[PDB]
């Protein structure tokens, strides 16, 4: 590891305080939760409703909360 140089005195992927690292939330998962019946399409969906309906476990929640990704969902 001393043959390898340092990069970026923090380090390559490095956390710092207030780096924004979001836990991913796949639109696939969300839509599936809606069609399966965990969640209400009727009511505005907060992170709270996602946690209560259990679609995301506590270990996934960390600041800042979540990103919304579209994975394999074309509409």
């Amino acid at each position: 590891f001393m043959l390898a140089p340092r990069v970026s005195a923090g380090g390559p992927r490095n956390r710092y305080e207030g780096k924004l690292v979001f836990s991913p939330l796949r639109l696939s998962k969300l839509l599936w939760a809606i069609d399966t019946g965990r969640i209400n399409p009727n009511e505005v969906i907060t992170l709270y409703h996602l946690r209560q309906a259990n679609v995301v476990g506590e270990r996934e929640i960390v600041w800042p909360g979540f990103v919304l990704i579209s994975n394999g969902v074309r509409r």
């Binding site: 696939s28 998962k29 599936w32 994975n71 394999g72 969902v73």
Partner: protein
């Protein structure tokens, strides 16, 4: 050294200019082509090369059924005939636009359906397969000895309940080559990864579960 030549002039679609006068006292691109001081530019450096684009992955949250995998199931001498492929896919888009559609068979982008029931009545399937609490089909792909991070995988099929051995014996026709074991709670299929999970889920969906 007088630097000149007819190579400075553009020539389009065929070069009809005399070939002795192209580069005069200047290195041609053929001279730098044979003289390059690096070596073997990588296969990714071919830009014109036409790369493949993967189809939409079958995930646990997204059921994307591929007609041809299903064809891999239909060629087989299975018993318990399968629903035709059209029925495993949810109703269409412009057909489901308004409120005229039923509640059970609702349109899903993901694609999701409650089980269809058996493709044929007047017949009794020997086993029954329970969906998850989220409505996922049973098989899980694990790794034998994950602490080493070993690429070799197996498939654990759990919620199967009924005669499990008849289940095993259809599972034989799907994976003729692989190794199979039964235990009261679950069925193991060795050397089969996510692909195998995709087939399995097609067969179970098409079986009416």
């Amino acid at each position: 050294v007088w630097l000149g030549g007819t190579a400075a002039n553009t020539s389009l679609g065929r070069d009809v200019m005399p070939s002795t006068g192209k580069y005069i006292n200047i290195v041609s691109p053929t001279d730098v082509a044979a003289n390059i001081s690096a070596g073997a530019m990588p296969p990714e450096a071919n830009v014109a090369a036409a790369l493949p684009v993967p189809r939409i992955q079958y995930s646990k949250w997204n059921r994307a059924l591929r007609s041809d995998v299903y064809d891999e199931l239909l060629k087989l001498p299975l018993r318990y005939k399968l629903h035709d492929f059209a029925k495993l896919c949810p109703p269409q888009r412009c057909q489901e636009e308004p409120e005229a559609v039923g509640v059970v068979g609702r349109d899903s982008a993901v694609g999701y359906l409650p089980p269809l029931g058996p493709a044929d009545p007047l017949d009794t399937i020997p086993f029954f397969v329970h969906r998850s609490s989220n409505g996922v089909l049973p098989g899980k792909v694990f790794s034998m000895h994950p602490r080493n991070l070993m690429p070799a995988f197996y498939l654990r099929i759990q919620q199967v309940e009924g005669d499990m051995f008849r289940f095993e014996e259809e599972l034989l026709k799907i994976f003729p080559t692989k190794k199979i074991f039964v235990r009261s709670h679950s069925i193991y299929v060795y050397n089969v990864a996510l692909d195998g999970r995709m087939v399995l889920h097609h067969w179970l969906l098409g079986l009416g579960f």
